[PDB]
PDB file of N, CA, C and O in Angstrom:
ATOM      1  N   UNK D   1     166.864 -44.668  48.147  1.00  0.00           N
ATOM      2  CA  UNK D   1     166.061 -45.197  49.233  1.00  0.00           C
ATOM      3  C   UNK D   1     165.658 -44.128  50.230  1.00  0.00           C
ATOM      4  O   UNK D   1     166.033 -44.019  51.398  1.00  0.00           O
ATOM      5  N   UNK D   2     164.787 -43.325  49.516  1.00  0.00           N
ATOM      6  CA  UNK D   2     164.070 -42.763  51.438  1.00  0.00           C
ATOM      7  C   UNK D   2     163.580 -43.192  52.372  1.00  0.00           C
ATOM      8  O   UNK D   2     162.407 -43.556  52.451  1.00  0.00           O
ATOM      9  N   UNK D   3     164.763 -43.234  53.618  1.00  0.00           N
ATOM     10  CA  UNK D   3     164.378 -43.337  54.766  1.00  0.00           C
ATOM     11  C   UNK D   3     165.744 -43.063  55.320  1.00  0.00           C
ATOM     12  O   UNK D   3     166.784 -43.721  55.283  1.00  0.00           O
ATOM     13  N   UNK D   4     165.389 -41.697  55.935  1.00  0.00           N
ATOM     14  CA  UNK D   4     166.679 -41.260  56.755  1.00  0.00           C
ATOM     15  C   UNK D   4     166.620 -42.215  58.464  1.00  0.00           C
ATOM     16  O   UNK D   4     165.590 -42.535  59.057  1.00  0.00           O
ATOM     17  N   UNK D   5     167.721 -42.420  58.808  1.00  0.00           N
ATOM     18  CA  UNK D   5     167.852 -42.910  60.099  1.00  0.00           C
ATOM     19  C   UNK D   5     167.619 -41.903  61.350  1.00  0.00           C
ATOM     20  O   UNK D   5     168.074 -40.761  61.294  1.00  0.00           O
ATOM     21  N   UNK D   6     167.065 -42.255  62.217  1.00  0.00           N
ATOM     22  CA  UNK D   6     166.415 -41.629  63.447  1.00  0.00           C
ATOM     23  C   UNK D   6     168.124 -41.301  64.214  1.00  0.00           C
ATOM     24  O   UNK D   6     168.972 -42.150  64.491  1.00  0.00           O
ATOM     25  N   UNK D   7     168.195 -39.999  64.378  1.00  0.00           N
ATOM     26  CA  UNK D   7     169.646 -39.989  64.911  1.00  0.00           C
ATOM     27  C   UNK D   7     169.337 -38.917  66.646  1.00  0.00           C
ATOM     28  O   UNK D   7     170.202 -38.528  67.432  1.00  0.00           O
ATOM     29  N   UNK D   8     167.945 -38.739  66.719  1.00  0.00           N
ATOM     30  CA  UNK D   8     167.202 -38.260  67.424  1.00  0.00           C
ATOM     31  C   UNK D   8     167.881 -38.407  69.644  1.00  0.00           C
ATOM     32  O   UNK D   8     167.330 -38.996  70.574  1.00  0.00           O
ATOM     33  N   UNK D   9     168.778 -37.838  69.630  1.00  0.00           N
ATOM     34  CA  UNK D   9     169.081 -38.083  71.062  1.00  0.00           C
ATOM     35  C   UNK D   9     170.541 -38.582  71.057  1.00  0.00           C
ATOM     36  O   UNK D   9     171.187 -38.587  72.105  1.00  0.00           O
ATOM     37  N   UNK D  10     171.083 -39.015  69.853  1.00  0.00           N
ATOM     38  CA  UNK D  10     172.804 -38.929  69.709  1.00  0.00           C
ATOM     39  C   UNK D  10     173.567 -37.525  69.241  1.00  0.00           C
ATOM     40  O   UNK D  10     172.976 -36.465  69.038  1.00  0.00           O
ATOM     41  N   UNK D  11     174.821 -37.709  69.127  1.00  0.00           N
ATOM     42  CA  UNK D  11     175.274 -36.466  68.860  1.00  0.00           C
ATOM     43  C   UNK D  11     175.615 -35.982  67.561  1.00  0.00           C
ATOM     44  O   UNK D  11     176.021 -36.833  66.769  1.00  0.00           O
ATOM     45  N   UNK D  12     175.534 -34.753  67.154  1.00  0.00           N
ATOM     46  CA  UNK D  12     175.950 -34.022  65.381  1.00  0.00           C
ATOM     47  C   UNK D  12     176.942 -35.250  65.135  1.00  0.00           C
ATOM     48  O   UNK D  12     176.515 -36.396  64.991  1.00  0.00           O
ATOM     49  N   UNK D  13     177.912 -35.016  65.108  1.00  0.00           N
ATOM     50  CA  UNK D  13     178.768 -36.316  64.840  1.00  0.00           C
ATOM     51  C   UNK D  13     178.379 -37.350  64.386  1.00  0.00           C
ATOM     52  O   UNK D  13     178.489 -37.396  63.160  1.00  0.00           O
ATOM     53  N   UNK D  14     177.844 -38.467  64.979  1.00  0.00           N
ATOM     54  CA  UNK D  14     176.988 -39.488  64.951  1.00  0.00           C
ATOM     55  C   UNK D  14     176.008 -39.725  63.927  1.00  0.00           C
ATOM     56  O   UNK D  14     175.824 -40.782  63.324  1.00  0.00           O
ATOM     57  N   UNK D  15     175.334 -38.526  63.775  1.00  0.00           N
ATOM     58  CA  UNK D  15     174.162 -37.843  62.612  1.00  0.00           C
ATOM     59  C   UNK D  15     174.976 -37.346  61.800  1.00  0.00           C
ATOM     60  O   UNK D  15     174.959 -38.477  61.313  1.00  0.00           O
ATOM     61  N   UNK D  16     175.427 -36.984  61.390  1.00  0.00           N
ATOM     62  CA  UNK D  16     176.437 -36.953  60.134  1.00  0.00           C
ATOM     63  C   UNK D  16     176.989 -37.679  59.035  1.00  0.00           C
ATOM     64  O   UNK D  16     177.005 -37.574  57.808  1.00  0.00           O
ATOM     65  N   UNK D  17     177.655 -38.829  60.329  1.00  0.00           N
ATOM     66  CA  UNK D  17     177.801 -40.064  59.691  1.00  0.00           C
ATOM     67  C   UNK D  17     176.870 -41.028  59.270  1.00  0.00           C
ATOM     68  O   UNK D  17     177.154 -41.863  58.411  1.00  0.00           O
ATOM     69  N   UNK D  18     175.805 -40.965  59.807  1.00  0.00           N
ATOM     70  CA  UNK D  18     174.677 -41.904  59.141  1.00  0.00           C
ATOM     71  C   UNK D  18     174.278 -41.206  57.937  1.00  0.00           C
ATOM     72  O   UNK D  18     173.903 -42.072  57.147  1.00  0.00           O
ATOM     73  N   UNK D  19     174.175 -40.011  57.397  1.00  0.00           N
ATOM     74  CA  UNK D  19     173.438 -39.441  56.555  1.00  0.00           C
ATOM     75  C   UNK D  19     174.540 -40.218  55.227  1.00  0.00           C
ATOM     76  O   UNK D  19     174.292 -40.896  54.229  1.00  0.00           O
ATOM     77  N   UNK D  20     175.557 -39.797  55.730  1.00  0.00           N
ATOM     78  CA  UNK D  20     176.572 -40.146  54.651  1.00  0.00           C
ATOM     79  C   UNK D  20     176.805 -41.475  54.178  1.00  0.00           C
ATOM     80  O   UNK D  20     177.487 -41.782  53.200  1.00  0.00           O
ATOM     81  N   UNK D  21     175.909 -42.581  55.291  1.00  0.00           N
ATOM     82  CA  UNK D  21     176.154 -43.637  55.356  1.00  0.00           C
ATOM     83  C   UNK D  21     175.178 -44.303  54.219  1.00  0.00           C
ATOM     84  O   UNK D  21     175.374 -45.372  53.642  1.00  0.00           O
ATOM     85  N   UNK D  22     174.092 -43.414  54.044  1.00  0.00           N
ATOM     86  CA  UNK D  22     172.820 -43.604  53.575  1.00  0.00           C
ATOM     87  C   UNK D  22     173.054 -42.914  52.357  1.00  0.00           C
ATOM     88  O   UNK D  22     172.079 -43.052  51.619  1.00  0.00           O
ATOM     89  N   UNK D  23     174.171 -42.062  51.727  1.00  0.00           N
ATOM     90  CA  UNK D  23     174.355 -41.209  51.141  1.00  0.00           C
ATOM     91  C   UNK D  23     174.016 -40.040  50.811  1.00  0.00           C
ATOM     92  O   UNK D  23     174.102 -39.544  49.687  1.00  0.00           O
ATOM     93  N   UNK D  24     173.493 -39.405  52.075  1.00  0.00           N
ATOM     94  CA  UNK D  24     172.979 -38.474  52.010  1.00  0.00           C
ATOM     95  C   UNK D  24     173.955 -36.972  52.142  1.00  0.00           C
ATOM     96  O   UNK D  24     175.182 -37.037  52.067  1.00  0.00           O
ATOM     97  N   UNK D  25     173.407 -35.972  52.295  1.00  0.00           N
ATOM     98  CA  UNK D  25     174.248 -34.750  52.345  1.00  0.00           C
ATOM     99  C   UNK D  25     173.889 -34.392  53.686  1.00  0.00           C
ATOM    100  O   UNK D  25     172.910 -34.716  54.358  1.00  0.00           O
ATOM    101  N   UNK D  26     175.118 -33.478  54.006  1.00  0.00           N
ATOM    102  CA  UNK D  26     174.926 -32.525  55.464  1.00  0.00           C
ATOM    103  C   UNK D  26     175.242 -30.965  55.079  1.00  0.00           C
ATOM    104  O   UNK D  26     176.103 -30.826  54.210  1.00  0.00           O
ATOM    105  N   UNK D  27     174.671 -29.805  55.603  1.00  0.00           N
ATOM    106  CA  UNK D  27     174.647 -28.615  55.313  1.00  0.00           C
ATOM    107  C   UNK D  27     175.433 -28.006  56.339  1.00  0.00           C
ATOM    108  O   UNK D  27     175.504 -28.696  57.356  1.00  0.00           O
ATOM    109  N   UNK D  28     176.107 -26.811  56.377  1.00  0.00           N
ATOM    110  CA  UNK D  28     176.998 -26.101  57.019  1.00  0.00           C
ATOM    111  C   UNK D  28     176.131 -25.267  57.856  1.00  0.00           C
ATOM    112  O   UNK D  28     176.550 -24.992  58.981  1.00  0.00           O
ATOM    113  N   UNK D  29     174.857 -24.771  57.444  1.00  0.00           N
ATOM    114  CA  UNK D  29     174.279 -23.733  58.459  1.00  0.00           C
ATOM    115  C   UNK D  29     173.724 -24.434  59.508  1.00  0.00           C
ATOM    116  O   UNK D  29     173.423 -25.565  59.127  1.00  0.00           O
ATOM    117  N   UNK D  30     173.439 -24.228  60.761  1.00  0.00           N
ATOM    118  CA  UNK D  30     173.408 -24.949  61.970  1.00  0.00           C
ATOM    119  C   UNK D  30     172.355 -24.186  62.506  1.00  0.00           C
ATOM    120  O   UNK D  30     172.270 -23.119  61.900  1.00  0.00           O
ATOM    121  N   UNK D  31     171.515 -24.305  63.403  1.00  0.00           N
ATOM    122  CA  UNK D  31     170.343 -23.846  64.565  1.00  0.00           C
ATOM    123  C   UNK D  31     171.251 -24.536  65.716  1.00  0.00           C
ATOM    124  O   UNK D  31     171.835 -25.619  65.741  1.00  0.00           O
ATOM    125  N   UNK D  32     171.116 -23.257  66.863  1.00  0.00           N
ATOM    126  CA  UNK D  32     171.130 -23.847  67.796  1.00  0.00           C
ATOM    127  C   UNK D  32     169.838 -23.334  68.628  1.00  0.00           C
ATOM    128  O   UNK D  32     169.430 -22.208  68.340  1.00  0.00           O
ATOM    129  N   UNK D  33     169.015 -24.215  69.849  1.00  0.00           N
ATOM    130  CA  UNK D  33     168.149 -23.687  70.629  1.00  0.00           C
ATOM    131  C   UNK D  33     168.251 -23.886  71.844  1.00  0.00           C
ATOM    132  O   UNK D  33     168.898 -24.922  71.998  1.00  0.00           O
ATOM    133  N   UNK D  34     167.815 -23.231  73.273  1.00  0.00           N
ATOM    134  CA  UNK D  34     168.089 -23.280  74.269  1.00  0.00           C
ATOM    135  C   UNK D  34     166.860 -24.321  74.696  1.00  0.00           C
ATOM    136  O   UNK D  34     165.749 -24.487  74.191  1.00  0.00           O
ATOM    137  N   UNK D  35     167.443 -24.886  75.709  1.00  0.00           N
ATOM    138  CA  UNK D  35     166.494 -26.245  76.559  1.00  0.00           C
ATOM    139  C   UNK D  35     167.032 -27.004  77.699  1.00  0.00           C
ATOM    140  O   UNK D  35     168.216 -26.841  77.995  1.00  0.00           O
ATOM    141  N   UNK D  36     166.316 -27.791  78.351  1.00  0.00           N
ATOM    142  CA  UNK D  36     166.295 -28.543  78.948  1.00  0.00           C
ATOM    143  C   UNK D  36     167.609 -29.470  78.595  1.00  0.00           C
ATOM    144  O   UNK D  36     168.050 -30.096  79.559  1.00  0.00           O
ATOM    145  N   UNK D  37     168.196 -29.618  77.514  1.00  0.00           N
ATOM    146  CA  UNK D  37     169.135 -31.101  77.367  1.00  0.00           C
ATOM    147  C   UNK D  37     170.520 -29.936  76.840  1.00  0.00           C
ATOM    148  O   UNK D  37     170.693 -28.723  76.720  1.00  0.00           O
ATOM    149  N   UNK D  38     171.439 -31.470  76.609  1.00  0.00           N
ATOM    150  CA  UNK D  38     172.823 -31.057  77.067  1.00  0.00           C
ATOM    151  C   UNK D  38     173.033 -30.665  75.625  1.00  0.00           C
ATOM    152  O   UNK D  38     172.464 -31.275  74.719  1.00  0.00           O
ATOM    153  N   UNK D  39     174.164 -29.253  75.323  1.00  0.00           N
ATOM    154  CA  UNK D  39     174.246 -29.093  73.866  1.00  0.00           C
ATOM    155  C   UNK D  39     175.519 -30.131  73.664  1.00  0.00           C
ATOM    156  O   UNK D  39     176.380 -30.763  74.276  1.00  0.00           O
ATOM    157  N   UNK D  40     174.866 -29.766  72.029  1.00  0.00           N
ATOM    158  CA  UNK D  40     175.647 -30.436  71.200  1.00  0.00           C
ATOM    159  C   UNK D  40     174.596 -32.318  70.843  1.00  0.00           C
ATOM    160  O   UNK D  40     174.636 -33.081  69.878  1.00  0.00           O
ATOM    161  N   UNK D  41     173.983 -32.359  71.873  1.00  0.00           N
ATOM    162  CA  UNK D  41     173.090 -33.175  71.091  1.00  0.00           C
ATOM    163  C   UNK D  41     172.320 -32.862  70.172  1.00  0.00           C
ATOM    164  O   UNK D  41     172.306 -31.689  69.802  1.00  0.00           O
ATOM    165  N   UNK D  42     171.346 -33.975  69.463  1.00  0.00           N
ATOM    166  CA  UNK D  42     170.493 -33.126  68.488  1.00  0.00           C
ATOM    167  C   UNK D  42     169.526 -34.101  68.715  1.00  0.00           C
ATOM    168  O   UNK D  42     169.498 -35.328  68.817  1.00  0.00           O
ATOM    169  N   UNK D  43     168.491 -32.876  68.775  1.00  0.00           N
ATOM    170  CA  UNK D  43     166.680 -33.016  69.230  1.00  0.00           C
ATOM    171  C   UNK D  43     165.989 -32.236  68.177  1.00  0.00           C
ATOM    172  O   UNK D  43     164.789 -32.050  68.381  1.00  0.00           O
ATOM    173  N   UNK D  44     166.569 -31.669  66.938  1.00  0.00           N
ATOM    174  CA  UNK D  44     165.808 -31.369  65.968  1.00  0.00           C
ATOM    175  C   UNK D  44     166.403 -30.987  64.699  1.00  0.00           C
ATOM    176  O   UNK D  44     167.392 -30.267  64.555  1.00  0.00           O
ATOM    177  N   UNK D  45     165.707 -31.538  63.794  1.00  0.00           N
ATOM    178  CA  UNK D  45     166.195 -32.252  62.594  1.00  0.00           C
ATOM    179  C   UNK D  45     165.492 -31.111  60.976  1.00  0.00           C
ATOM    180  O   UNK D  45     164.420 -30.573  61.250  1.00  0.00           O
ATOM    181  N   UNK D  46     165.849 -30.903  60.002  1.00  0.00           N
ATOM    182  CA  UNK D  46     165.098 -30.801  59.265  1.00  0.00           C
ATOM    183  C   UNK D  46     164.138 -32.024  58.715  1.00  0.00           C
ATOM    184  O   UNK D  46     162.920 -31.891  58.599  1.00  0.00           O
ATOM    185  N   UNK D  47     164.800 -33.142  58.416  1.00  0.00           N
ATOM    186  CA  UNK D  47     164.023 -34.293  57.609  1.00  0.00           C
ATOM    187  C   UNK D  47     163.410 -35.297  59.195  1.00  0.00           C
ATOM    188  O   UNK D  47     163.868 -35.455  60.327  1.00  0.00           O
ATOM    189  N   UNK D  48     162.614 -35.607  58.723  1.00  0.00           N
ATOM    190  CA  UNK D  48     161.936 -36.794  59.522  1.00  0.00           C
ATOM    191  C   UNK D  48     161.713 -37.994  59.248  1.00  0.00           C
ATOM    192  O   UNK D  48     160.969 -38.169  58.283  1.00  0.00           O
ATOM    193  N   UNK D  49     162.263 -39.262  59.977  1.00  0.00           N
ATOM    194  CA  UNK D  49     161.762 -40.368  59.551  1.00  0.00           C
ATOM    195  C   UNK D  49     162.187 -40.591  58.459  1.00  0.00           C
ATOM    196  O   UNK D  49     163.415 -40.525  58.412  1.00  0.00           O
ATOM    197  N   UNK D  50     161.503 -40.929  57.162  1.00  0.00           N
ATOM    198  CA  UNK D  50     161.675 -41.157  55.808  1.00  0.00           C
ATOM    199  C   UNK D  50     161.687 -39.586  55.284  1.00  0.00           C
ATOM    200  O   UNK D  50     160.903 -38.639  55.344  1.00  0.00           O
ATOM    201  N   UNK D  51     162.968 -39.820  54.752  1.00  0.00           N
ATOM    202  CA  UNK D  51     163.552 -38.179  53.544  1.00  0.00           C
ATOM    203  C   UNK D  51     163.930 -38.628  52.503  1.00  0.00           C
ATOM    204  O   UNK D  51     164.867 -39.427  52.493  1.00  0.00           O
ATOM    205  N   UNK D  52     163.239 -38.195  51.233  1.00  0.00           N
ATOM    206  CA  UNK D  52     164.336 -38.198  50.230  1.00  0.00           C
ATOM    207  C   UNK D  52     165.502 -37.147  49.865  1.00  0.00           C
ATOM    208  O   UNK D  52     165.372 -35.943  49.644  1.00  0.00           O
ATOM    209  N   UNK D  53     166.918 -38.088  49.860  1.00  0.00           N
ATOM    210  CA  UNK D  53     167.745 -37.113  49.316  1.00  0.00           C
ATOM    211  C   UNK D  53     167.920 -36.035  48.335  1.00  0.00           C
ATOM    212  O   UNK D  53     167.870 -36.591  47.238  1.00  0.00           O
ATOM    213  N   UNK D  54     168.054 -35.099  48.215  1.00  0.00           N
ATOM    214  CA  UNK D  54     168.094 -33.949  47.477  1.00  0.00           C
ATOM    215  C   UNK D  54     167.823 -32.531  47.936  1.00  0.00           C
ATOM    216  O   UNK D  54     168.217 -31.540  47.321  1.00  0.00           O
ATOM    217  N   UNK D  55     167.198 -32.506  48.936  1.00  0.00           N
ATOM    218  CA  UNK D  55     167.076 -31.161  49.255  1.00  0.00           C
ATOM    219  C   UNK D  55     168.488 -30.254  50.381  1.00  0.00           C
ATOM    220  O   UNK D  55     169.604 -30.182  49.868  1.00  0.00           O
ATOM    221  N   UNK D  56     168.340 -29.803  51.450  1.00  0.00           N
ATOM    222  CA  UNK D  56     169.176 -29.439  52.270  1.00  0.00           C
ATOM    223  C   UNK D  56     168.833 -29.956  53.835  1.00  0.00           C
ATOM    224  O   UNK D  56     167.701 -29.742  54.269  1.00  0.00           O
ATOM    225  N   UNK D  57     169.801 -30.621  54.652  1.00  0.00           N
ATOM    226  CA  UNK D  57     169.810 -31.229  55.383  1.00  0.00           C
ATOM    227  C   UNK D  57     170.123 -30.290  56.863  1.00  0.00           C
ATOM    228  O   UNK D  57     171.321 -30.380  57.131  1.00  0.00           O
ATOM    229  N   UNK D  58     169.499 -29.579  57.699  1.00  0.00           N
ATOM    230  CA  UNK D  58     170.819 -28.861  58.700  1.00  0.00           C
ATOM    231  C   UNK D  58     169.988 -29.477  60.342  1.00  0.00           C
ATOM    232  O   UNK D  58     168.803 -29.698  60.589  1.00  0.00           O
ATOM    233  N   UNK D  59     171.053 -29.577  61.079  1.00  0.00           N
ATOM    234  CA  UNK D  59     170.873 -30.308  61.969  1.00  0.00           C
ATOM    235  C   UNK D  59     171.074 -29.494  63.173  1.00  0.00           C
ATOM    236  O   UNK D  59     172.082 -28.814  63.364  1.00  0.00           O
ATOM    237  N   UNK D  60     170.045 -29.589  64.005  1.00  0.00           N
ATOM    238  CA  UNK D  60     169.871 -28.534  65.338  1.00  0.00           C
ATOM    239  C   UNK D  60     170.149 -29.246  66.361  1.00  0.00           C
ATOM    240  O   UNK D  60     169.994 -30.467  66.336  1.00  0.00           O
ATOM    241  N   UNK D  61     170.594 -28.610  67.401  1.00  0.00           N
ATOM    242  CA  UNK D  61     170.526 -29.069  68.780  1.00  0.00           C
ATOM    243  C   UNK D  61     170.484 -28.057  69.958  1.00  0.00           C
ATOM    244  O   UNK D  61     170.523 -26.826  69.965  1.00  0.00           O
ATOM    245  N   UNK D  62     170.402 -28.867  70.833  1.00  0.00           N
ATOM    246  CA  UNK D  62     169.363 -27.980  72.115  1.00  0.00           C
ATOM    247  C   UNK D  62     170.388 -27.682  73.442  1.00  0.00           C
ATOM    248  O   UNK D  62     170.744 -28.639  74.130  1.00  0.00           O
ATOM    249  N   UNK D  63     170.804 -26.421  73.736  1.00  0.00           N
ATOM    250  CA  UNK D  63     171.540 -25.797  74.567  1.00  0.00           C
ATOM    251  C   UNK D  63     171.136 -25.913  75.631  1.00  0.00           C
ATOM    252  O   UNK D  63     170.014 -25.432  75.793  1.00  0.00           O
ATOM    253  N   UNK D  64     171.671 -26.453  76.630  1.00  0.00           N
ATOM    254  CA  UNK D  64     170.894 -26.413  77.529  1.00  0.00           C
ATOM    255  C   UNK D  64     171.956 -25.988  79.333  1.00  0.00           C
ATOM    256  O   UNK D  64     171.679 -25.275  80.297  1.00  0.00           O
ATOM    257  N   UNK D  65     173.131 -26.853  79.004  1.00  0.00           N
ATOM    258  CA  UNK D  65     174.368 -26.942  80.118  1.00  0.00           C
ATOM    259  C   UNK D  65     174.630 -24.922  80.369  1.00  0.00           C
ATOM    260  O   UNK D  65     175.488 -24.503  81.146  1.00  0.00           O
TER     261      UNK D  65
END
């Protein structure tokens, strides 16, 4: 079923568990970027919206504190 869940403004954690929930995979290499919002959230994603599983998944978030 592609359609990854919007995890857009919760935390790595949180997004993790949905991927897995959906059966998806999570990747070890990480982005982090500096911004406006608090780290450790995540405001940017490789997949969007609807993903199909199979490729590599890594999940960014925005430094900001």
């Amino acid at each position: 079923g592609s359609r990854v869940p919007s995890v857009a403004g919760l935390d790595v954690d949180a997004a993790r568990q949905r991927l897995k929930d959906a059966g998806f995979q999570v990747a070890d290499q990480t982005n982090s970027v500096n911004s406006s919002a608090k780290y450790g959230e995540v405001v940017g994603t490789s997949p969007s919206g609807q993903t199909i599983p199979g490729s590599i998944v890594t999940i960014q978030i925005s430094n900001g504190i």
